[PDB]
Symmetry: D2
């Protein structure tokens, strides 16, 4: 059971001054955990891992849409580049499950719940950007399985190494990270950090500056 | 007002053998109108234009339209990085599906995706293609419903087809001949998602991937 | 005999305001002939065209180095991405032929002429960015053939549609362009335009501003 | 002074199965030190650093070194685009080849590539890797010969090896363990050019691609 690229507690970040970061976030971050390009190369591998398990068949790519879908979009770009070479053209269904608004994350409020029965009898790939406690995903899996898919696998860019974890482990994991609050790449903080390319740890002045 | 990059009816696009195209689509396309990289370069200029005119809320039209939206917003993020202050960008989503009608003439739209973040904001409607202009018109009256500070439409593609005469698009990537196109952001019954270029579907393609 | 992507006299450019161009070149260009991304997609195809003819064997990639090697670098990046999939790893020799300093371009002055006999018995791919009269290339071919390669093919990004052409046609051509003086992408004018992504036509104020 | 991104001897790099690696190199590598995208992000910062310190002439070390040079200059071009005035950038080239010496201890360098554009200019020496530091030292005394206004060394890689003690590099991408690396910019007898990541060669790789 590969936990992905492990970012240790004892290593962890890169120094902020080692990478290009927008000047308006100078004081808003602690460390860079995962540079943009590292995310990309790992995602390229995830796509290949996904195709070994699910390739050659239709498959339904389902984005867990909360703040954004940047990871979904990049994973799909890589999966699509792998599909190019196949002798037969393989159809690909792209869908989003939108979840509405972090201490009761297990309670899901789905907004777009139309023709959920399109999942029935289908090979479903659920794509998440971050798993923390894992409560959201385990309840989302309860919903999805009631529609009887042929197969359900979950890919998550990030899994947080927390005691608060309920023990849910995704089938595909990009990176296993320390138990710190991260922003950037695909993760916004109240609509900020959208322009930050790298997964980084928010600072306390960032937390205070950008609060809702 | 630009009409955008005008692709003429006279010698439209490029021969298939001049660009890289998945081997499984060899019989399925007629010509390539817009190679991927050309889409990207024009989208970069579109992002620049959007920032000129337009707090902004960017509206993605769900399912179809994540692709062009993602790229357009990527370029907008690239311009945003240099600002003195980190300036908030809201992304909103609506689901919109169209169905053919074999009777009458009446149009079928099903809207499914909450729009509480639209009042007093500058709204950008992002579309993939304008043909009849009914999707645009539907998106407009739905946004006008929440009383926006500003409303603009950006669309990667506009077909040279006769239409009623709604509100011409503000930001246009490409003005293209009246052909049915697939690739980049446009699928055909879930096929062509792996095709990066905007190309005209062939009759072999239509019958092979029909549904 | 495919002349590449033909850019007509009657179409030709795109309007400058249709693309992103650095502000310091605002007044220095007439039209954009080939946007950066178009160059890339055509180059991707060239790489595949090259591998159909020369693939599966070592091959020596020889850059005609004058001002720069941007086209060489991008073509090789694409050729290398095609080599990734092969069952056997295929060695690739990368070399440069440097030509020293446009009315007697047929006279070549080669600077780096060391172990030119490495070309002997080898499959050689000569890479050029622009052909105008074609005199440079035909004399360069005279030199190269004297070292007895197994095969010589020439790829050029651009071929200019000029009456001044001596009739040399490359084996691989990206684009056939009108008879206008172009800069950008790989083409500098006295060290300017290095930062311009697109192949564009220099204006008269650009010509005057940036002259040697 | 940065030493750059420090890759430690303690748990160095990543397992091969965590990144995409050409199938033909499956037996030929030990571990991956630096995935391609990580190289690119750091190079972007290096380009920013170069522009801080440094008219500039950028010196490519021919054959080996076109790759890292091209990427470093790409990022420098990206920063340059925004300037109020188009600022000239000179690129220069020298050929440099090293040969093993099985006797003595004496070093073999062959220099082959004209350097008239160096007097009174800021010169940037661009290298791929510093191990012994003899290439750097050779490039230095050759550039000092033409009396530059400024001289700087940028190198993507610096090995944690004992060396004489020349002029430590000014711009360093990565400080890496004392292992023999291939990929990205470094070949092994013409192999690994299609490998995008910096990785340690295996004993199977060494014997298979030996020469
Ligand atoms: N941006 C960001 N968000 C987080 C983080 N940790 C938990 N969350 C919140 C949610 C993500 O929706 O974690 C979900 P769960 O796995 O706790 O149910 C974090 O580090 N960064
Ligand atoms: N793939 C593809 N789809 C299209 C095309 N033209 C119209 N459509 C469909 C609708 C969008 O659902 O056109 C938008 P409009 O007719 O509502 O303006 C087309 O050429 N290719
Ligand atoms: N930048 C640029 N250079 C050019 C051009 N036309 C001829 N040249 C000069 C040379 C290129 O070295 O043409 C060589 P030949 O084919 O005339 O020998 C041009 O349009 N742009
Ligand atoms: N591919 C590869 N090559 C290397 C390496 N270490 C030294 N070299 C060779 C020379 C450059 O020719 O090292 C530079 P220096 O020893 O002169 O500083 C290495 O790890 N990989």
């Amino acid at each position: 059971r590969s936990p992905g690229v492990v970012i240790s507690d004892d290593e962890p970040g890169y120094d902020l001054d080692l990478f290009c970061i927008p000047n308006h976030y100078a004081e808003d971050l602690e460390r860079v955990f995962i540079p943009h390009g590292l995310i990309m190369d790992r995602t390229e591998r995830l796509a290949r891992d996904v195709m070994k398990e699910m390739g050659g068949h239709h498959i339904v790519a389902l984005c867990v849409l909360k703040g954004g879908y940047k990871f979904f979009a990049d994973l799909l770009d890589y999966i699509k580049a792998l599909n190019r070479n196949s002798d037969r053209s393989i159809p690909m269904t792209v869908d989003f499950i939108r979840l509405k608004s972090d201490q009761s994350t297990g309670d899901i409020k789905v907004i777009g719940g139309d023709d959920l029965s399109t999942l029935t009898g289908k090979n479903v790939l659920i794509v998440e950007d971050i798993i923390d406690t894992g409560k959201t995903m385990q309840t989302l899996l309860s919903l999805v399985r009631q529609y009887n898919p042929k197969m359900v696998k979950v890919a998550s860019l990030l899994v947080k190494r927390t005691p608060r974890s309920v023990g849910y482990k995704p089938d595909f994991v990009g990176f296993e990270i320390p138990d710190k609050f991260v922003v950037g790449y695909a993760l916004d903080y109240n609509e900020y950090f959208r322009d930050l390319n790298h997964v980084c740890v928010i600072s306390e002045t960032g937390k205070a500056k950008y609060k809702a």
